[PDB]
Amino acid sequence: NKYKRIFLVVMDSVGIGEAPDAEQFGDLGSDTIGHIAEHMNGLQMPNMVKLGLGNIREMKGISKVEKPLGYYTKMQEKSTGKDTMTGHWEIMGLYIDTPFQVFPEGFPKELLDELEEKTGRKIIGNKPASGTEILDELGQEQMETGSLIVYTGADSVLQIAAHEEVVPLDELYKICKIARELTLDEKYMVGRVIARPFVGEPGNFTRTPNRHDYALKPFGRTVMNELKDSDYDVIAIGKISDIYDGEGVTESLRTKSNMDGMDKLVDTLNMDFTGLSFLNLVDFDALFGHRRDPQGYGEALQEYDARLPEVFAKLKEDDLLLITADHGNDPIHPGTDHTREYVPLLAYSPSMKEGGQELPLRQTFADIGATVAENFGVKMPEYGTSFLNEL
Numbered sequence: 476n477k478y479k480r481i482f483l484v485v486m487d488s489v490g491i492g493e494a495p496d497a498e499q500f501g502d503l504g505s506d507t508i509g510h511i512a513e514h515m516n517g518l519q520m521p522n523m524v525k526l527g528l529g530n531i532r533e534m535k536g537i538s539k540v541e542k543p544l545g546y547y548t549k550m551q552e553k554s555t556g557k558d559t560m561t562g563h564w565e566i567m568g569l570y571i572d573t574p575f576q577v578f579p580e581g582f583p584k585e586l587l588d589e590l591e592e593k594t595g596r597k598i599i600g601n602k603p604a605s606g607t608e609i610l611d612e613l614g615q616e617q618m619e620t621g622s623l624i625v626y627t628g629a630d631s632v633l634q635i636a637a638h639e640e641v642v643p644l645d646e647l648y649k650i651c652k653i654a655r656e657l658t659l660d661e662k663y664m665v666g667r668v669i670a671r672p673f674v675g676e677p678g679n680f681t682r683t684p685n686r687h688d689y690a691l692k693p694f695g696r697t698v699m700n701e702l703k704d705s706d707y708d709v710i711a712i713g714k715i716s717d718i719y720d721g722e723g724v725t726e727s728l729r730t731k732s733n734m735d736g737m738d739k740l741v742d743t744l745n746m747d748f749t750g751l752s753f754l755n756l757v758d759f760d761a762l763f764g765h766r767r768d769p770q771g772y773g774e775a776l777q778e779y780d781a782r783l784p785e786v787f788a789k790l791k792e793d794d795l796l797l798i799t800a801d802h803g804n805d806p807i808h809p810g811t812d813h814t815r816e817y818v819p820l821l822a823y824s825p826s827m828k829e830g831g832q833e834l835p836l837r838q839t840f841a842d843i844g845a846t847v848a849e850n851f852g853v854k855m856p857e858y859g860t861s862f863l864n865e866l
């Protein structure tokens with residue numbers, strides 16, 4: 476192998492400006508990093524700048540450098556959707572024609588009617604909410620009736636809440652598996668069905684760690700599957716395992732924050748493995764993008780950037796670091812959905828003695844998967860063009 480280890484970091488939702496097809500999605504004008512940089516009066520990301528972030532595009536506080544540490548470009552999404560699953564599945568070598576749906580006004584009556592009819596249970600609520608706002612509103616009615624609280628969120632999710640002493644935990648799981656089957660339907664296709672058991676009494680409800688997420692498997696065998704099948708390590712960090720429903724994963728390390736994610740990345744740098752370490756930094760998306768909070772988003776990007784020098788210090792000559800994103804989520808954009816944007820790509824190894832250069836723009840996120848596959852000599856994905864030889 477050219478590289479013994481590849482460290483792939485997805486800065487979830489960290490877009491670098493509207494894609495050519497942005498108008499289809501109502502995303503004209505979107506620019507995640509650029510709008511954050513303006514809000515911050517100049518982003519302080521000296522380490523990403525050293526890698527070549529500003530060579531991809533100049534933004535407030537983010538300038539080009541004469542000699543970027545590694546190679547740089549941006550990537551265009553080919554798949555139909557702009558959701559997390561679509562982006563990640565594309566990154567690992569697929570093409571996804573059918574988009575996952577988000578439901579800001581709640582779910583169609585048709586879906587919920589079928590769920591009632593298959594379960595013999597009433598459904599109440601139907602609408603976006605936090606799992607503490609909706610329990611305050613409807614938790615008592617749930618206890619007294621045995622009905623199911625259905626709700627959504629800013630992401631492609633269907634969430635089902637029931638009190639554990641009224642609807643047995645095992646029943647709630649069965650109901651969620653039924654819903655997972657009903658939602659394999661392009662009209663209603665949610666990324667995740669989520670069991671949200673709760674306990675307590677009116678005015679004091681709390682969700683339990685008995686939460687269960689029901690994900691769809693990727694629509695194809697990914698580069699991860701191929702690495703696992705050839706006895707390589709595939710270490711998933713953060714939401715990565717859930718995003719791929721475990722497919723091709725050999726070890727999974729849960730994280731609770733972006734900083735915890737960077738700690739786990741450092742943990743893998745200390746591991747003797749051969750294969751792929753794959754991190755998702757989700758806070759950008761979950762805490763800041765969807766909540767339209769550019770200040771919090773800017774601060775998180777600066778916290779992330781400050782962690783990078785330790786990573787640079789630990790990378791070996793036969794290590795490759797890849798930094799990218801899975802879509803945009805512009806915190807100054809209307810509504811609460813993702814934004815259809817290019818994503819940055821930075822590729823760095825300490826073995827790059829003369830530093831990096833610009834890569835041709837990547838026409839699909841699958842160029843990452845193709846590059847990983849070629850590095851490790853496993854079956855090449857159906858989609859994507861490797862840039863391994865360019866590095």
Ligand SMILES: [Mn+2]
Pocket residue numbers: 500501502503808809812813814
């Ligand atoms: Mn939009």
Ligand SMILES: [Mn+2]
Pocket residue numbers: 487488558559560562760801802
């Ligand atoms: Mn995402």
Ligand SMILES: [Mn+2]
Pocket residue numbers: 559629630760761765813
């Ligand atoms: Mn999201």
